[PDB]
Amino acid sequence: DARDLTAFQKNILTVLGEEARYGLAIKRELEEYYGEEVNHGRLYPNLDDLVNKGLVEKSELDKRTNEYALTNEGFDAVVDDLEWTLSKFVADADRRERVETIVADDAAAL
């Protein structure tokens, strides 16, 4: 599994689970999550790690810009952790109601 990834690496995969993105756009999504700046020197070595692990695929677009996307193995890692999180969180009917409301509101906002 990918269950030994860092939180930062897992968050990259979560970002790419929404859609494929350029490196700079991943950085912005992570900054919005953390509420803090994310340095290029942290992001890109971690992207290279995820590509080497087969969880992310890279597509070069010019010379300063790459597009990154989940592989199926990377998507499986996102789903695996979501399934585990939900298995623990959905502990009674009120928890089930909370989750279902979140999902339906996210879908309605699309």
Query: Which residues in this chain contact a second copy in the complex, by CB under 8 A?
Result: 1, 3-7, 10, 14-15, 17-19, 33-35, 78-79, 82-93, 96, 98-100, 102-104, 106-107, 110
Q: Tell me the residue type at 92.
A: D
Rounded Cα gap, residues 96 and 65, in angstroms: 42
Site string for Cl ion, 46-85 (x = CB under 5 A): -----------xx------x----x----x-----xxxxx
Smallest gap from Cβ 22 to a second copy, in A, equals: 16
Task: Draw the binding track, 6-45, toward Cl ion (x: CB under 5 A; -: no contact).
Answer: xxx-x----------xxxxx-x----x-------------
Q: Which long-range contacts (CB under 8 A, 24 or more apart) does 13-17 make?
A: 13/50, 13/55, 13/56, 13/70, 13/74, 13/77, 13/78, 14/78, 16/56, 16/68, 16/69, 16/70, 16/74, 17/70, 17/75, 17/78
61 binds, among Cl ion, a second copy, none (CB under 5 to 8 A by kind): none
